Amino acid sequence: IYRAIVTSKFRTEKMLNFYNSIGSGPDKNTIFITFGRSEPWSSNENEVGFAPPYPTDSVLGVTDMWTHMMGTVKVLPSMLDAVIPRRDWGDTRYPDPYTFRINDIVVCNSAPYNATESGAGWLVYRCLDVPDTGMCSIASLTDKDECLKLGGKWTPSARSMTPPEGRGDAEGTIEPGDGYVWEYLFEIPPDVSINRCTNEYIVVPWPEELKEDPTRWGYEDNLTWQQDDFGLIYRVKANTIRFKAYLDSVYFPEAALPGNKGFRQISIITNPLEAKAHPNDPNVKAEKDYYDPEDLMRHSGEMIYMENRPPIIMAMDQTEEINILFTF
């Protein structure tokens, strides 16, 4: 008899609680990324389009993971980035380069066809309104607000004749005139773009990092903080965390030996405990940065994510980058 819904702001909430929960202390969580394996999938595993087996969400799956674990890397917050699907205004290398949709977060000033204010990093804007005529996804209802009395995912006809520029009005509202409307959100720093961003995704700072260094993210001229309190991740429907962990082979010389067939498994384990002598002892939370699986209480903590992929070669003191996408 009751009609309820979890609003998308809940998807962001989860993502935030998770990111905030991480910390040192018994009151906090420590997550460890893990790698391991050697037993090659099959012969034809180095082929192109080769899909290894999915990981088995089961205790046998978990143990089959812990058995092949070769080492562990503590994941700190500075390695987690709230990210959203990247969409550059006019990138014809993908679909609909000029036609968008309401609430679509579009990036600008990242390419010659984005160039709007050199010297600044990528500027990200939100699409508030679009051109009248178009399609309402479901049913029909089309005109000035025919699909705006209910507001269903609406794809317009006419295109964006031009990228929005600057930081809009006090509320970042910009009216290009092409029948579109945008809201200036923020500015991504060069290094962040270079180091953290990708072709698929961009980074959204966290409320905290935003409140501490506003100008850094082109968030200073912003007043919507008097309302959202640095809740940008909320404003752009961010609900995805992209990791960025480097495997320091310099740590372990175990597989940094010539041959090596690399590992094919990855897993994120939360709150694993340090191997105890007398099993009837007080469990200890693992808070160091690295660990030898044997130095870790097998099965301790919770395994929230397992990954299977082709083998990855590791050298002497060669640095290997690990990235994963958690969604909420």
Alpha-carbon Rg for the chain in angstroms: 23
Q: How far is the CB of 177 from its own copies (least distance, A)?
A: 24
Q: Which residue in this structure is represented by tokens 């562990």?
A: 72
Residue 158 or 297 having the CB closest to its own copies: 297
Phi, psi of 218 (to 5 degrees): 55, 40
- Give buried/exposed letters for 141-170 (b at 16+ CB in 10 A, else e): eeeeeebeeeeeebebeebbeebbbebbee
What track of x and - describes contact with Br ion for positions 204 through 243 (by CB under 5 A)?
--xxxx----------------------------------
Residues in 82-121 that interact with Br ion by CB under 5 A: 96-99, 112
Q: How far is the CB of 126 from its own copies (least distance, A)?
A: 11
Separation of alpha carbons 204 and 185, rounded Å: 10
Of 297, 312, 322, 324, the residue at the interface with Br ion (CB under 5 A) is: 297
| Partner interacting with residue 119 (select from its own copies, Br ion, none; CB below 5-8 Å by kind) | none
Tokens linked to 290: 């690295």
Tokens linked to 281: 């002892």
| DSSP assignment string, 246-268 | EEETTT--SS-SSS---EEEEEE
Separation of alpha carbons 228 and 232, rounded Å: 7
Of 39, 46, 59, 115, the residue at the interface with Br ion (CB under 5 A) is: 59
Residues in 238-267 that interact with Br ion by CB under 5 A: none
| Partner interacting with residue 304 (select from Br ion, its own copies, none; CB below 5-8 Å by kind) | its own copies
| DSSP assignment string, 92-125 | TTSS-SS---TT-EEEESSSTTT-SSTTS--EEE
Residue 154 or 174 having the CB closest to Br ion: 154
| Partner interacting with residue 209 (select from Br ion, its own copies, none; CB below 5-8 Å by kind) | Br ion
| Partner interacting with residue 262 (select from its own copies, Br ion, none; CB below 5-8 Å by kind) | none
Let me know how long the chain is: 328
Separation of alpha carbons 205 and 132, rounded Å: 33
What track of x and - describes contact with Br ion for positions 61 through 80 (by CB under 5 A)?
-x-------------xxx--
Confirm or reject binding of residue 20 to Br ion (CB under 5 A): yes
What track of x and - describes contact with Br ion for positions 151 through 190 (by CB under 5 A)?
--------x-------------------------------
Which positions touch Br ion (CB under 5 A)? 1, 8, 11, 16-17, 20-21, 24, 58-59, 62, 76-78, 96-99, 112, 159, 195, 206-209, 275-276, 297
